Design an enzyme around this catalytic site. Sequence first.
Site, PDB file in Angstrom:
ATOM      1  N   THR D   1       0.867  -1.217   0.000  1.00  0.00           N
ATOM      2  CA  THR D   1       0.000   0.000   0.000  1.00  0.00           C
ATOM      3  C   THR D   1       0.893   1.254   0.000  1.00  0.00           C
ATOM      4  O   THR D   1       1.976   1.276   0.650  1.00  0.00           O
ATOM      5  CB  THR D   1      -0.949  -0.055   1.207  1.00  0.00           C
ATOM      6  OG1 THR D   1      -1.602  -1.321   1.203  1.00  0.00           O
ATOM      7  CG2 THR D   1      -2.013   1.011   1.191  1.00  0.00           C
ATOM      8  N   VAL D  30     -11.513  -7.556  -0.356  1.00  0.00           N
ATOM      9  CA  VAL D  30     -11.366  -6.086  -0.523  1.00  0.00           C
ATOM     10  C   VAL D  30     -10.849  -5.501   0.780  1.00  0.00           C
ATOM     11  O   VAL D  30     -11.600  -5.546   1.763  1.00  0.00           O
ATOM     12  CB  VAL D  30     -12.673  -5.388  -0.920  1.00  0.00           C
ATOM     13  CG1 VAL D  30     -12.391  -3.947  -1.304  1.00  0.00           C
ATOM     14  CG2 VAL D  30     -13.421  -6.116  -2.037  1.00  0.00           C
ATOM     15  N   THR D  52      -2.603   2.759   5.714  1.00  0.00           N
ATOM     16  CA  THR D  52      -2.044   1.447   5.342  1.00  0.00           C
ATOM     17  C   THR D  52      -2.117   0.502   6.533  1.00  0.00           C
ATOM     18  O   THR D  52      -1.496   0.885   7.565  1.00  0.00           O
ATOM     19  CB  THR D  52      -0.561   1.594   4.997  1.00  0.00           C
ATOM     20  OG1 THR D  52       0.041   0.302   5.065  1.00  0.00           O
ATOM     21  CG2 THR D  52       0.225   2.536   5.889  1.00  0.00           C
ATOM     22  N   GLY D  55      -6.211  -4.809   6.917  1.00  0.00           N
ATOM     23  CA  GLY D  55      -7.308  -4.166   6.185  1.00  0.00           C
ATOM     24  C   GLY D  55      -8.653  -4.167   6.852  1.00  0.00           C
ATOM     25  O   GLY D  55      -9.297  -3.122   6.892  1.00  0.00           O
TER      26      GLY D  55
END
Lengths: 154, 155, 135, 134
Positions: D1, D30, D52, D55
């Site tokens: 990222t 995702v 970052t 997730g």
Amino acid sequence: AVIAIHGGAGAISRAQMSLQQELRYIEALSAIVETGQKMLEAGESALDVVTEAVRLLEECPLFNAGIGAVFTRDETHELDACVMDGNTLKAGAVAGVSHLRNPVLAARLVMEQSPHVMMIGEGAENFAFARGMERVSPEIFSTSLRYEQLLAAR
Amino acid sequence: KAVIAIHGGAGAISRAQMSLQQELRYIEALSAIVETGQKMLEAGESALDVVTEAVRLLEECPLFNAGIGAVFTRDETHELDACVMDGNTLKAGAVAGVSHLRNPVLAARLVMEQSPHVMMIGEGAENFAFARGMERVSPEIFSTSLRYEQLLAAR
Amino acid sequence: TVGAVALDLDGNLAAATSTGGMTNKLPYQVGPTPLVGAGCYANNASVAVSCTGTGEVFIRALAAYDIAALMDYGGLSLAEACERVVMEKLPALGGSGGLIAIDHEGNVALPFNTEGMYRAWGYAGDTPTTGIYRE
Amino acid sequence: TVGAVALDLDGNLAAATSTGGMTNKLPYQVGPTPLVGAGCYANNASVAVSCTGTGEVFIRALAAYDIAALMDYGGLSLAEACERVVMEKLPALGGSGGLIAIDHEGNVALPFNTEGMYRAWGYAGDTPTTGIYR
Ligand SMILES: [Cl-]
Ligand SMILES: [Cl-]
Ligand code: NA
Ligand code: NA
């Protein structure tokens, strides 16, 4: 007027790295932040500045975005990006794209040429291709080092 | 203080366009689903199971644009999305762009409960759900003549 | 778009939202529904919210999480937060629609800025209310 | 990222984030990067943020928008908001990572709870700062 950039957070190991190895990352980060500072000083927009900085970080194979993207469970690349304009509160995002060299440029296209905000996969790709963005093979993203990290993680 | 609220969508609902009989079909569906939720809450069922079942019923109800009765895309297909969030754990599960799952909210709850992920998309979401024994359907089952007539009206 | 929010007898909040999106949409367009804080949000500390409306504006405005943050951080009541979001901020971005919300104290709100919203609510052990048009 | 945030000479804020995600990810999982208010958020009224990290936690915590709301509604400074999110709330959910944030006043923060975050920043026509470790 000011810029900040990042190239990702995690378990970056000091006892694993030489100073020369570290300096490769420091040099890349300083060159990109300097490009952004110079753009800002010349009166470029925050949006153009964050777009170009992220484009350069995508191009930089040391960082996990664009060229140097990590490998998926299937030894593929799936990329995501987002951009937001704080002036209009418009945003554009692409999720799960494999055939766009610079996802941030695709994200900006969604923001600027659509109301959609977020597009996914083939739809995001077809959106960009219908507006003349070039199609690539995900093989261009592949680096030996990220491949070694895939083999390590298994 | 246990309580439920539901919706079936916001928009240009036209009074001069609707008969009382048409309106009562919506009122009947809303009251039946809200009453199921109240009864579940009163019996001590969880908020998560309550909102899951209420949204499943709204999906099955062909009057509402979710599951059965989903609008048509430009390509005369159906693509469905759902999300569920537990206020207790702040866990969430979501599916976007699914066509072969009868009840997207149950797929969303599967992501929440049976994966370390929050959001899955498209065939990946479907393959995840199928691998967890969720049944595959044809997106034809979502089709209603009314939503089809609205597609033809728009173009 | 459809949705539900609930507070149970244990004081837990939950929210769920499901949709087929806008008539005639592009395939692979993602509206607020599956996006945490856009179409759906729940937190025992604040609110459970389920949204329905102009899709993009609900994402850009992160409508579901904005209700929560306005309450948690801003100290707005559920009613003030729902008014701010649905009647001021969404229209400011050209967003039309509404949402349903329950807070940790069991207050309920069903705001909408459109001609109608198919909706219903009820306390456990009480009679339900239903609606279509503006109250 | 990777990410960038900036304030321009017109007082405009913008943010951008791009990623290949987690090594060995499921395709069609995702992360926060393409989710407005999770991996990316900008509002001239508050802050531009690029995140970052782990997730899911950034999504569940809507990290990028939470900075903005903590500032705008909570009256927290950028520094207080970044501390609350990255050092308290993300770890509380078992989330690891960081973010970069610039506010409408040109204050800059690069918090992270990890061993490192590849980062840099600079005022226009001043010399840039770079970092990797804590
Ligand atoms: Cl009514
Ligand atoms: Cl350092
Ligand atoms: Na790169
Ligand atoms: Na339905």
